[PDB]
Symmetry: C3
Subunit: 181 residues, 3 copies
């Protein structure tokens, strides 16, 4: 259908540092030629370098790699079990076979070895919504086996938070991009 | 309809510090699973610590509380007179009975949890569009821990640290774009 | 939901300082009462003051002027040949005659001589996606034209990038990250 999502309230479904150590929420809503996205992430397994932040790790990356049918590939940060077209508050029960309608346009965002600013959205965001804890979010489109499409979410910060008992978690963030078809 | 708004050019319709001391513009456009929003606010007419800014008050808050039908509740910052589905440049003449399609998803943004970071959007914006006057906007979904109790809520909090009393600046914002997952 | 765009991968189609010195990408998607936009720009002609940046110019402005039918007018930064409704990866072959559905609402964003913050979206962005090169983007709806221009625009959309950094000792091409925004449509 016109929504491809994690469900609105996913179980731990993402690796930042180790298996299913995070809840990654992503809703892609197809508005014809453009996808409207909202994304959030939270570390949930206690004792990782990001839960609480101990300052040994100052980035968190979620890599989504997609084959030529827009199907999530195994070498992605996120598990594909509940990455699917919407049905009510959950996902359709059968894995989708084609989501090229949700893939980032390869004309707008080409696969290249050159750093191309147009491939990315780069914004200042705030760790746990705290304006004293600035962070950068880079969303990059199409940045073995080789992926045909990709969507990468990179959070980076320079602050030291060790012994503030801060869990890595983000505010919801809105973005858009041109769809492949 | 698929648009729930204040009209594009509202009359003073909002309390920041006192009754109808502000024009709050909000357009919610239903794109299936997601609402696309654009918001702006200006202190107007009524003299106050925000008109002009005298540096005693360095936040402005608009609280929208909704019942289980997504109907605006009386204990909101904004008056409901011209909060309705679109008709041309104005609102339909009959008060809406259901806008649950526009309410923030209680799964995505669970209730009372203003402190769960996923419930909010937090962004750097600019007081009066002046890039020397940085400000934060926090949009919080379903944050409120209140009678009568709201089922859904949307809170807009502007905050800044600068001192502007000498500049005779009235509190006003740029238009700001956001989105959130809809309840249905 | 209808799309008015530059195509996703435009040829040089834009003046920042001189004719076709830039690639301006703009995709406007009509979501009923609101338009959803994504914009990017890159200077492409080598030897311009923005390619590489020589610090004589620390703003880049794209002015789009539209008549009462929402048709792009001659004195715009962008060429209109491939500004049109989407067909596949390109534009429909016939020039559109009406896009008022895509124009910024004159009630929300009036034409006035008074500076009105609500007419604009202002955000911090980063030159070439580099966080050490902070930049502002101002998107203004229905800003006033040059006083000596005729015919006058009914609608307008201005994109202003500004920065304070000096980059002449580097070899920086002016180019932006993709940027998402929305606005209330006229109809
Ligand atoms: Ca002139």
């Amino acid at each position: 259908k016109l929504t491809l999502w994690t469900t609105p309230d996913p179980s731990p479904n993402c690796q930042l540092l180790s298996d299913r150590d995070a809840k990654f929420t992503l809703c892609l809503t197809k508005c014809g030629s453009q996808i409207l996205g909202t994304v959030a992430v939270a570390a949930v397994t206690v004792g990782s370098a990001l839960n609480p932040i101990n300052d040994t790790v100052k980035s968190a990356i979620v890599f989504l790699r997609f084959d030529s049918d827009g199907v999530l590939m195994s070498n992605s940060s996120m598990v594909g079990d509940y990455w699917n077209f919407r049905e009510g508050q959950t996902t359709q029960s059968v894995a989708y076979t084609n989501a090229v309608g949700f893939m980032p346009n390869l004309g707008a965002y080409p696969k290249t070895q050159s750093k191309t600013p147009k491939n990315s959205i780069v914004s200042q965001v705030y760790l746990n919504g705290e304006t004293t804890m600035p962070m950068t979010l880079t969303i990059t489109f199409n940045g073995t086996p080789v992926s045909t499409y990709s969507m990468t979410f990179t959070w980076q910060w320079t602050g030291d938070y060790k012994d503030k008992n801060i869990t890595f978690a983000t505010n919801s963030f809105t973005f858009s991009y041109m769809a492949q078809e």
